[PDB]
Amino acid sequence: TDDSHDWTKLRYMDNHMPADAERARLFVRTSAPCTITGTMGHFILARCPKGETLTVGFTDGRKISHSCTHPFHHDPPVIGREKFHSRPQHGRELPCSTYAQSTAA
Amino acid sequence: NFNVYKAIRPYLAHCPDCGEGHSCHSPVALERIRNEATDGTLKIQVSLQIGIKTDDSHDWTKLRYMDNHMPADAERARLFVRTSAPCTITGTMGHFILARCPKGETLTVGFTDGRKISHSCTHPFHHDPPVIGREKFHSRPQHGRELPCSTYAQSTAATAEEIEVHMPPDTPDRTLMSQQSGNVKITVNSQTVRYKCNCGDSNEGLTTTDKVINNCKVDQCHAAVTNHKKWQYNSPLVPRNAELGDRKGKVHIPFPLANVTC
Amino acid sequence: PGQFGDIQSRTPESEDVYANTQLVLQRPSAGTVHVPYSQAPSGFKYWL
Amino acid sequence: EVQLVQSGAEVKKPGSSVKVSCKAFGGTFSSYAITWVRQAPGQGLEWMGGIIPILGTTDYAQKFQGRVTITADKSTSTAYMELSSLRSEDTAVYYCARDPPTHGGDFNYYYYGVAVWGQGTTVTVSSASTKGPSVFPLAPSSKSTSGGTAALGCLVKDYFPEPVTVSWNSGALTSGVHTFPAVLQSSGLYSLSSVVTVPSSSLGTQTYICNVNHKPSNTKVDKKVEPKSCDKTH
Amino acid sequence: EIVLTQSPGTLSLSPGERATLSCRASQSNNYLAWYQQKPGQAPRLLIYGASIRATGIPDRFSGSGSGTDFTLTISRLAPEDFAVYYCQQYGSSPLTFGPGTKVDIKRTVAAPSVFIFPPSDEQLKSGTASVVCLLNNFYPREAKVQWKVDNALQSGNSQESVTEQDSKDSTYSLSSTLTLSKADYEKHKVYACEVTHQGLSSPVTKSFNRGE
Amino acid sequence: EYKTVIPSPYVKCCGTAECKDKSLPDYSCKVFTGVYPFMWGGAYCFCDT
Amino acid sequence: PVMCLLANTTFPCSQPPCTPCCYEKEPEETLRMLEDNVMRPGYYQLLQASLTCSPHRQRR
Amino acid sequence: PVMCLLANTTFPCSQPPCTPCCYEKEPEETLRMLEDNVMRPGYYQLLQASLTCSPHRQRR
Amino acid sequence: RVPKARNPTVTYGKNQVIMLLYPDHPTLLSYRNMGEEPNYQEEWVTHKKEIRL
């Protein structure tokens, strides 16, 4: 709320006043919990399992848990010729595209 | 023998997917997953050691990971294993975890590190249990018949299931060496070092105290910790100590495959 | 390989094994210590 | 901009628990990704693992939590370590004066910015009693210096603690003095030296002297200078 | 993994020249950045990389690289540009700091400078039979000390240490001492302080006698 | 259920290993050339060829 | 060339006439410098100045 | 029955040839004891006597 | 990084290859003639299967 850049914190609008809450209690889930992989200001990166819905949520300072849910059909496209589920030890490199984790302008 | 774990310690190993999509060296690498229990129970082998701690003693509230050179303690209360969704762990002793798992095409195992980081390792793994009988049911009913199946029994016994142990390979570390201008010094944080150079160095070898190698350029210097007084599982995905193999030893892996009704 | 009987032994406790899994070792991926291998999956687990 | 501030050096005994000081400013007025790096003399740099970006939870890297068993403060700009039960091998410059160090495993990531650096406090793990600067050589007896056209120097040995204050000929030659090396040794005692680089033709006009001062002993050094290859010594 | 390998371990240049430093790693993905240390001086940021770049000193630096390795170059070396130069990419999973490259602007070079002082004569009970060394001004560095006591070779009980450089001159240095008891400084008279540097192989030598 | 048994790979720095051939139920071994494996804290081998 | 305006007077986009600490010396007025022009390329440098502050410790 | 061996010597398995708490005293014992010796039917009891040693801190 | 499906167990016949396929996950099989008409065909295979081409 004081505009200091504390990584462990986030701020939300309590009626008319910005108010603080803990970063460690932010979550995003679809069919099951997503790995967050970067955040800053209004934005979150996440790696999510396949699912027909998305919700983001956080625990308030006053211990109450807020969430928001949108319908969002997530089913990421195949790379290459196999419908695999997590990267193997052994394989081939193929070209794809990624949101880079750096908060650069 | 159950208290073999005085002799052998956890390790880092190369995990394919540390939860964020990148491969890296992980305290939690899972070396084998096995699914021979027809009841759908799952036995998982991991580079942690659980049910023990540093100051080598059994403790069901703790596990030890390898904090790069030193084994280090963390709480069993924050171990997890999940597949498509959270598994319930049904037994943990040594390198071995039992879990009961929902159907899923991945296995990810993980824990919370003493410095409050969360670590995990994720493998592609098609967990789809065989059906017992003639109905693809999902959880056991309060009324039914009993059919023969098999289970990893929840006993940490002398199973006659055996895994071999070997001493580590020499563990390399770039921070064992510093360029003092014109020379490099080997430095010894109380683990004995092997070192080698080609800067005209006639005297490559071993030390248990800091040493200077004359004229040396840090690019042409190499060093690794060498007198390991603890052993490891001889996994793939860590180097062998020598071409001949190594001097061995064994561990009896817990949880034997009993036949039982479901 | 990978059909029923790709591993055979004369009794449960026998030390003899015949196996034909076509295990083929593969080059390790650059900058890593693993052993990758290709093999026909267990022909008994398929049969079950 | 961001700016960092620390205490100059800490005189500490081994086996103690010690605060190590910081405050941060310069365009922030409050916390922003503060972290530490620590370097023992003759080593390369090493990020002080107990302190990656600790501004709401205390860190460790992989390794650490040996004798470097440590916690670090989150509070407004005031990123103090408490380095606990330290040993002689932990004698180092502790650079708190360091840039946003983007972490990982921990799932969030940081800006590149303007960055920040600065001083690093010397935690001087020591137990030596205080001792004067040139009580080993130049205060009690003699000096001679066997040749070269500007090969003239002065000596200070087996002393504790720093800082010594030094000058040549009442400060008059400070235009041609070069301020020259010092060390802290494995004995827990310091050593220091100084030179004048003025050549034969322009030192030869002087009947010449040099001096040293040290408050932790309450002593003064003086000796007369007499070269072997100056213009006055042909 | 990754293991940041700075390719040049050490370099030397005239002022007016351009330096370039290179670093090799197995993958990069987030900004590794460049910082330097003159002996006893505070660091500062040179440059950031991996895809974007930003640089902290009013521009005479530039940095680039992809597909293999990552680099920093300094346009026209001139003043106090002597340092060890490092690159790094912070904590996370286990991965370590860069090893550093020494570079400097060239001296008006000469053969090794050496010191040959008496200790003190009154108080030999304190150990002032011991003879003290300081070395300066040599180039490049392999300046190991050699000693003689009354024209006999000695190497033992030596107070080995590393000094900071010649400051304004910025040439290399060391200091040490032969630790000796009492009586031999009173029986006898003579010493030599000597330097077996690679630039000469056979040493530079200084000597004195207790008669002066 | 077969078990595929795989000991730690032998990696030799600065020279060729060779196949220590033996009779085991479906034994195979292979020597892969020009490896440069990394442990957690450094390269395992001295050279990269 | 490129330039920025104080709703009337015009200047090069290295800083607004209010100088650093701008959002703390002309609060919210600082943002109207970006209202009635942001289409010229220089305006991210006016933003860089407008939201940078110079407390007593700063010394580059 | 059958028994264990070590270098020049043959001896019964269930107490060490080195003094008890032998792994705590000389932890590299396995690097002499277990080159090819893993084939011994007594190795399980040699291991139990070596590590779960019933050391001088315990009682029976 | 993407996986490579493991080698099939192939065997031959008069103008045929017979391949036994072992997918760990849905895997595309494609084939074409190397002649003037490629007669391109494909399928995702999701379980162990024998193909005759």
TrEMBL record, chain C:
Protein's cellular compartments: Host Golgi apparatus, Host trans-Golgi network; Host cell membrane; Host cytoplasm; Host endoplasmic reticulum
Domain of life of the organism encoding this protein: Viruses
Role this protein plays: Provides the signal sequence for the translocation of the precursor of protein E3/E2 to the host endoplasmic reticulum. Furin-cleaved E3 remains associated with spike glycoprotein E1 and mediates pH protection of the latter during the transport via the secretory pathway. After virion release from the host cell, the assembly protein E3 is gradually released in the extracellular space. Acts as a viroporin that participates in virus glycoprotein processing and transport to the plasma membrane, cell permeabilization and budding of viral particles. Disrupts the calcium homeostasis of the cell, probably at the endoplasmic reticulum level. This leads to cytoplasmic calcium elevation. Because of its lipophilic properties, the 6K protein is postulated to influence the selection of lipids that interact with the transmembrane domains of the glycoproteins, which, in turn, affects the deformability of the bilayer required for the extreme curvature that occurs as budding proceeds.
Assembly with partners or alone: Homodimer. Homomultimer. Interacts with host karyopherin KPNA4; this interaction allows the nuclear import of the viral capsid protein. Interacts with spike glycoprotein E2. Interacts with host IRAK1; the interaction leads to inhibition of IRAK1-dependent signaling. The precursor of protein E3/E2 and E1 form a heterodimer shortly after synthesis.
Full protein name: Structural polyprotein
Organism: Chikungunya virus (CHIKV)
Full-protein residues shown: 1006 to 1053 of 1248
Automatic annotation (TrEMBL), chains G, H:
Source species, domain of life: Viruses
Cellular compartments annotated: Host Golgi apparatus, Host trans-Golgi network; Host cell membrane; Host cytoplasm; Host endoplasmic reticulum
Disulphide linkage map: 4-13
The protein's role, per its UniProt record: Acts as a viroporin that participates in virus glycoprotein processing and transport to the plasma membrane, cell permeabilization and budding of viral particles. Disrupts the calcium homeostasis of the cell, probably at the endoplasmic reticulum level. This leads to cytoplasmic calcium elevation. Because of its lipophilic properties, the 6K protein is postulated to influence the selection of lipids that interact with the transmembrane domains of the glycoproteins, which, in turn, affects the deformability of the bilayer required for the extreme curvature that occurs as budding proceeds. Provides the signal sequence for the translocation of the precursor of protein E3/E2 to the host endoplasmic reticulum. Furin-cleaved E3 remains associated with spike glycoprotein E1 and mediates pH protection of the latter during the transport via the secretory pathway. After virion release from the host cell, the assembly protein E3 is gradually released in the extracellular space.
Subunit: Oligomer. Interacts with spike glycoprotein E1. Interacts with spike glycoprotein E2. Interacts with spike glycoprotein E1. Processing of the precursor of protein E3/E2 into E2 and E3 results in a heterodimer of the spike glycoproteins E2 and E1. Spike at virion surface are constituted of a trimer of E2-E1 heterodimers. Interacts with 6K protein. Interacts with host MXRA8; this interaction mediates virus entry. The interaction involves 2 adjacent E2-E1 heterodimers.
Identification of the protein by name: Structural polyprotein
Natural source organism: Chikungunya virus
TrEMBL record, chain I:
Protein's cellular compartments: Host Golgi apparatus, Host trans-Golgi network; Host cell membrane; Host cytoplasm; Host endoplasmic reticulum
Signal peptide start and end residues: none
Top-level taxonomic group: Viruses
Function recorded in the entry: Provides the signal sequence for the translocation of the precursor of protein E3/E2 to the host endoplasmic reticulum. Furin-cleaved E3 remains associated with spike glycoprotein E1 and mediates pH protection of the latter during the transport via the secretory pathway. After virion release from the host cell, the assembly protein E3 is gradually released in the extracellular space.
The protein's assembly and partners: Homodimer. Homomultimer. Interacts with host karyopherin KPNA4; this interaction allows the nuclear import of the viral capsid protein. Interacts with spike glycoprotein E2. Interacts with host IRAK1; the interaction leads to inhibition of IRAK1-dependent signaling.
Stated name of the protein: Structural polyprotein
Annotated organism of origin: Chikungunya virus
Residues of the full protein shown: 592 to 644 of 1248
